[PDB]
């Protein structure tokens, strides 16, 4: 059943699995009309499909054209997510297909189970974990490719850059979740921490700055401080 | 009017005949049930006073032969049997009637309850759900599992209800995943009605049979089947108007008949709330919604 603190280590075993996050699939700006009513304008979205072991990110860009003339978009978004994940599984060679797909939101279970009926051996699972994958659009290069897309497009990233050369997938996933948690809690502060020292750059083929092991420890410390501060602010504690 | 004679009543038992029931004492001189309306299926059911576990019973149609009950002291139950000798049978029934050893099927003239619960229920269809082709009557009990329950063990003693599964390839056409899951009209009308049942009469027949097995034997698998067949119609945006009107009547009589005290185990809260308040057909079951709201407002 559900992925939690108790069965966390399963993410880093040799059974292929993907997390699916649908939180950036359907995105809108809410605005006033000339008549003083409210209307939404859709903006480009993305499915965030992540192998937590390898760092391989299958970023399916959701172009605003897919909503044209459709009703109940928040509901269609779950089904479009399920259709795109199903199409991605079918596109992969058999030996690359996931054994499990973990959805970050329970509303994705039935849409994905129904789209994956052809794959009875792929387990569709919820999680108790509060994963900050909504903050994926606070990574500049992912936000850039989504907003510039003029048609539906799949872009492949490694969300861990070259980290797995130096650290395990457990530690890579912990770094990623701490960066995304920071970006989600206080984006300005998080991005200031990541880019304050111009001598550390982002390689053209990477998402994050090229920190030494020592500079990552300092960065990770600054992110934890950012998160606890904002927590004491939120909750006046 | 037909008769189901009993050889004897060696053990104390509650005997059911359709919606009626009678207590019989150990070795009470009881020789059966007379004045049974021709034209309907019937069920004669049993709960031993000493083991209220295993409600069991026999679906039969008196037009298909001469049936009697005889206690089997080896298997420890009241067994239905066919008497092939018509003259031996008329002779036995005439004797027991003359000595007034029989209870009368206690139908009220005004009362269409049993007709309304069994309108579409056919003995030929029961015998396909309950396979035992050497007998013209069908045994059901509390513990019998459904073909579907066995997939999720002995296939000989199974209820062969039509498998309904909303998250199955059968229910969902490739490339109509969201449409077919949110509006089950395709599954109801093409797969189930046109494809398997052939008409709404056979569909309602199985629905009605599932309910009666749930109510009389507390058969859990039958209760699941009854709810699934209701939910498939209520979850379809496109249903023939005549099916909706008839479903309202069918369900009205089922809810009317259900013992008030069994509502908590025989009624699925999720399915009823969905069918009366969220589903496409939420405004199509007036009679059923009025009786449910007045009789079981707690469930809703």
The candidate with the shortest Cα–Cα distance to A25, out of A104, A90, A141, A113, is A104
Classify residue A3: in a domain, yes or no.
no
- In degrees rounded to 5, what are phi and psi of residue A194? -70, -35
- Chain A residue numbers with beta carbons less than 8 Å from the beta carbon of B182 are 75
> What residue of B is the nearest CA neighbor of A81?
B178
Classify residue A4: in a domain, yes or no.
no
3-state SS string for B88-133: HHHHHHHHHHHCCCCEECCCCCCCCHHHHHHCCCCHHHHHHHCCCC
Strand B56-60 and strand B138-141: the pairing is antiparallel
Whether A201 and A176 map to the same domain: the answer is yes
Whether A61 and A119 map to the same domain: the answer is yes
The candidate with the shortest Cα–Cα distance to A47, out of A104, A117, A3, A94, is A104
Contact in structure between A184 and A135 (CB atoms under 8 Å): yes
Classify residue A1: in a domain, yes or no.
no
State the Cα torsion B97-B103-B105-B111 to the nearest 10°.
130
Find the angle CA(B120)-CA(B229)-CA(B261) to the nearest 5 degrees. 85
Q: Experimental technique used?
A: X-ray
d(CA B284, CA B277): 11
Secondary structure of residue B57 in the 3-state scheme: strand
> What residue of B is the nearest CA neighbor of A120?
B168
- In degrees rounded to 5, what are phi and psi of residue B50? -90, -20
CA distance, residue A117 to nearest chain B CA (Å)? 6
Task: Please tell me the total count of domains within chain B.
Answer: 2
> What residue of A is the nearest CA neighbor of B176?
A115
Inter-chain touch B177–A111, beta carbons under 8 Å: yes
**Closest to B169 (Cβ–Cβ): which among A75, A76, A117?**
A117
Whether B103 and B189 map to the same domain: the answer is no
The candidate with the shortest Cα–Cα distance to B215, out of B48, B45, B68, B98, is B45
Q: What is the distance of C-alpha B236 from the center of its chain? A: 24
- Does A111 contact chain B (CB < 8 Å)? yes
Number of other residues whose CB lies within 10 A of the CB of residue B162: 20
The candidate with the shortest Cα–Cα distance to A19, out of A81, A90, A87, is A81
Inter-chain touch A114–B169, beta carbons under 8 Å: no
- Does B241 contact chain A (CB < 8 Å)? no
Find the angle CA(A138)-CA(A42)-CA(B184) to the nearest 5 degrees. 110
Inter-chain touch A117–B167, beta carbons under 8 Å: yes
- In degrees rounded to 5, what are phi and psi of residue B80? -85, 145
- Chain B residue numbers with beta carbons less than 8 Å from the beta carbon of A114 are 167, 172, 177-178, 181
Whether A130 and A220 map to the same domain: the answer is no
Whether B158 and B299 map to the same domain: the answer is yes
Task: Name the H helices within A38-108.
Answer: 73-91
Half-sphere exposure of residue A25: CA atoms within 13 angstroms, side-chain side: 25
Q: What is the distance of C-alpha A140 from the center of its chain? A: 13
- Does A119 contact chain B (CB < 8 Å)? no
d(CA A117, CA A119): 5
Whether A203 and A173 map to the same domain: the answer is yes
Q: Give the best residue of A73, A76, A90, A117 to mutate against chain B (max B CB count within 10 A).
A: A117
Inter-chain touch B178–A110, beta carbons under 8 Å: no
Whether A152 and A226 map to the same domain: the answer is no
Whether B68 and B205 map to the same domain: the answer is no
Tokens read off for A87: 């199409």
> What residue of B is the nearest CA neighbor of A79?
B178
C-alpha distances (whole Å) from A157 to each of A22, A187, A208 are 17, 21, 12
Strand B103-104 and strand B32-36: the pairing is parallel
CATH number, domain with residue B101: 2.60.34.20
Classify residue A102: in a domain, yes or no.
yes
d(CA A54, CA A159): 9
d(CA A127, CA A3): 4
Contact in structure between A124 and A78 (CB atoms under 8 Å): no
Contact in structure between B45 and B56 (CB atoms under 8 Å): yes
Whether B287 and B148 map to the same domain: the answer is yes
Whether B150 and B298 map to the same domain: the answer is yes
Whether A204 and A96 map to the same domain: the answer is no
d(CA B65, CA B93): 14
**End position of a domain, from candidates A136, A163, A190:** A163
Return the bridge partners of A230, or none.
none
Inter-chain touch A79–B178, beta carbons under 8 Å: yes
Tokens read off for A68: 């044209």
- Chain B residue numbers with beta carbons less than 8 Å from the beta carbon of A112 are none
Domain of residue A218, residue span: 164-237
Whether B150 and B292 map to the same domain: the answer is yes
CATH number, domain with residue A156: 3.30.420.230
Classify residue A219: in a domain, yes or no.
yes
Classify residue A2: in a domain, yes or no.
no
> What residue of B is the nearest CA neighbor of A76?
B178
CA distance, residue A7 to nearest chain B CA (Å)? 25
CA distance, residue B170 to nearest chain A CA (Å)? 10
Inter-chain touch A114–B167, beta carbons under 8 Å: yes
Question: Whose structure tokens read 């359709």?
Answer: B18
A110 Cβ contact list (under 8 Å, min separation 6) = B167, B181
Number of other residues whose CB lies within 10 A of the CB of residue A136: 24
In residues, how long is chain A? Answer: 237
Question: Whose structure tokens read 């009470």?
Answer: B28
Task: Name the H helices within A43-120.
Answer: 73-91, 109-115
- In degrees rounded to 5, what are phi and psi of residue A62? -105, 100
Domain of residue B197, residue span: 144-300
Contact in structure between B254 and B117 (CB atoms under 8 Å): yes
d(CA A189, CA A185): 9
Whether B116 and B205 map to the same domain: the answer is no
Inter-chain touch A76–B181, beta carbons under 8 Å: no
State the Cα torsion B63-B64-B70-B72 to the nearest 10°.
-150
d(CA A189, CA A236): 19
Terminal C-alpha separation, chain A: 35
Inter-chain touch A114–B177, beta carbons under 8 Å: yes
- Does B177 contact chain A (CB < 8 Å)? yes
**End position of a domain, from candidates A163, A197, A224:** A163
Whether B117 and B230 map to the same domain: the answer is no
The candidate with the shortest Cα–Cα distance to B59, out of B290, B185, B177, B216, is B216
d(CA B166, CA B114): 31
Secondary structure of residue B123 in the 3-state scheme: helix
Number of other residues whose CB lies within 10 A of the CB of residue A162: 13
What is the crossing angle of helices A213-234 and A187-195, to 10°?
160
Task: Please tell me the total count of domains within chain A.
Answer: 2
- Chain B residue numbers with beta carbons less than 8 Å from the beta carbon of A75 are 182
């Amino acid at each position: 059943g559900a992925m939690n603190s108790s069965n966390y280590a399963e993410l880093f075993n040799n059974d292929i699995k993907l997390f699916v996050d649908d939180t950036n699939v359907y995105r809108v700006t809410v605005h006033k009309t000339f008549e003083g009513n409210v209307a939404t304008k859709a903006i480009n979205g993305c499915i965030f499909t992540l192998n937590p072991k390898t760092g391989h990110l299958f970023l399916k860009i959701i172009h605003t054209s897919v909503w044209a003339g459709q009703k109940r978009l928040s509901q269609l978004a779950k089904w479009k997510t399920a259709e795109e994940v199903s199409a991605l599984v079918r596109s992969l060679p058999k030996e690359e297909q996931p054994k499990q797909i973990i959805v970050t939101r329970k509303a994705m279970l039935d849409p994905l189970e129904v789209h994956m009926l052809d794959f009875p051996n792929i387990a569709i699972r919820p999680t108790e974990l509060r994963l900050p994958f909504s903050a994926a659009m606070s990574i500049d290069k992912l936000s850039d490719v989504v907003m510039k897309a003029t048609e539906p497009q799949m872009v492949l990233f490694n969300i861990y850059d070259d980290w797995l050369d130096r650290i395990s997938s457990y530690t890579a996933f912990s770094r990623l979740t701490l960066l995304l948690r920071a970006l989600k809690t206080n984006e300005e502060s998080a991005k200031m921490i990541l880019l304050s020292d111009p001598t550390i750059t982002i390689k053209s083929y990477h998402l994050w700055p090229s920190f030494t092991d020592e500079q990552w420890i300092t960065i990770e410390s600054q992110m934890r401080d950012l998160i606890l501060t904002e927590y004491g602010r939120k909750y006046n504690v | 009017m037909n008769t189901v004679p009993f050889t004897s009543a060696p053990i104390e038992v509650t005997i059911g005949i359709d919606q009626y029931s009678f207590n019989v004492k150990e070795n009470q001189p009881f020789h059966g049930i007379k004045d049974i309306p021709i034209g309907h299926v019937h069920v004669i059911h049993f709960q031993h006073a000493d083991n209220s576990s295993m409600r069991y019973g026999y679906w039969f149609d008196c037009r298909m032969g001469n049936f009697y009950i005889q206690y089997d002291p080896k298997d420890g139950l009241y067994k239905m049997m066919e008497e092939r000798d018509g003259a031996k049978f008329e002779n036995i029934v005439h004797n027991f009637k003359e000595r007034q050893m029989m209870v009368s099927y206690p139908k009220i003239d005004e009362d269409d309850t049993w007709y309304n619960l069994t309108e579409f229920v056919q003995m030929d269809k029961i015998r396909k759900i309950v396979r035992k082709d050497e007998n013209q009557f069908s045994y059901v009990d509390s513990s019998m599992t459904t073909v579907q329950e066995n997939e999720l063990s002995d296939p000989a003693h199974s209820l062969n209800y039509t498998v309904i599964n909303f998250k199955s390839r059968e229910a969902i056409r490739p490339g109509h995943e969201m449409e077919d899951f949110l509006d089950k009209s395709y599954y109801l009308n093409t797969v189930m009605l046109q494809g398997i049942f052939k008409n709404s009469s056979n569909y309602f027949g199985e629905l009605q049979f599932a309910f009666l097995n749930a109510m009389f034997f507390g058969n859990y698998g039958s209760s699941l089947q009854w709810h699934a067949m209701i939910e498939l119609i209520c979850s379809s945006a496109t249903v023939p108007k005549h099916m909706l009107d008839k479903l309202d009547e069918i369900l009205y009589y089922q809810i009317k008949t259900l013992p008030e005290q069994y509502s908590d185990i025989l009624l699925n809260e999720r399915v009823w709330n969905i069918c009366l308040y969220s589903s496409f057909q939420k405004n199509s079951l007036h009679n059923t919604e009025k009786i449910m709201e007045n009789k079981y407002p707690e469930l809703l």
